[PDB]
Design a protein around this ligand. Structure first.
Ligand SMILES: *[C@@H]1O[C@H](CO)[C@@H](O)[C@H](O)[C@H]1NC(C)=O
Length: 209
């Protein structure tokens, strides 16, 4: 009885959830505190729209905000929808959603990539979406348990592909396609490119001496 420990050695608190991939299927794993339980995840059905059924692209940005699942935002009739690109302004295609399943995989923080738990409780308030509250930074984060005040387990919410970020070792933030360069006498030179791939990924080229 206690927190879960994956085969890989990763550690999840009781009541946390994460995503595991078994074969061609995506599983939703929960820590029972008695063990674990994984269940196939549902794929949100898309229909109609100007995409004509094109699958969601999550997260995506609309109206200068980031959405981690379908929304009724901007709809008068309360339909659920999702853009079919990470950037709904540049491009402008969307489609309708049948269900409102919400799975937000975090990165960084102290929750080993658990899902956002909604709602989570911070400063005695229940949040049904990621937030920047308490952050001078303005990065979006979610509680990975139902109560942050008590548990204090958090993660960083995703960013639309086009808005992804790579952070330098010293901490500076770069966007996709940006290049980071370090020069050490030319004897050693290294250039890195911010690819992101959801994981703030760098791909680098270096020479030796
Ligand atoms: C937050 O949600 C939890 C769910 O268990 C509930 O117990 C609590 O009353 C809620 N607090 C607020 C601010 O509504």
């Amino acid at each position: 009885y206690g927190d879960c420990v994956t085969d890989s050695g990763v550690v999840y608190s009781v009541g946390m959830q994460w995503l595991k991939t078994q074969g061609n299927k995506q599983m939703l794993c929960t820590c029972l505190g008695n063990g674990v339980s994984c269940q196939e995840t549902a794929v949100t059905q898309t229909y109609g729209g100007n995409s004509n059924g094109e699958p969601c692209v999550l997260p995506f940005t609309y109206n200068g905000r980031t959405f981690y699942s379908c929304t009724t935002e901007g709809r008068q009739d309360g339909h659920l929808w999702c853009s079919t690109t990470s950037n709904y302004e540049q491009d402008q295609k969307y489609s309708f959603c049948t269900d409102h399943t919400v799975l937000v995989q975090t990165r960084g923080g102290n929750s080993n990539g658990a899902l956002c738990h909604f709602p989570f409780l911070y400063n005695n308030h229940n949040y049904t979406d990621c937030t920047s509250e308490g952050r001078r930074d303005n990065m979006k984060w979610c509680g990975t348990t139902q109560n942050y005040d008590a548990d204090q387990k958090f993660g960083f919410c995703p960013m639309a592909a086009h808005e992804e970020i790579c952070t330098t070792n010293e901490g500076v933030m770069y966007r996709i396609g940006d290049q980071w360069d370090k020069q050490h006498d030319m004897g050693h030179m290294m250039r890195c490119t911010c690819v992101g791939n959801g994981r703030g990924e760098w791909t680098c080229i270096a020479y030796s001496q």
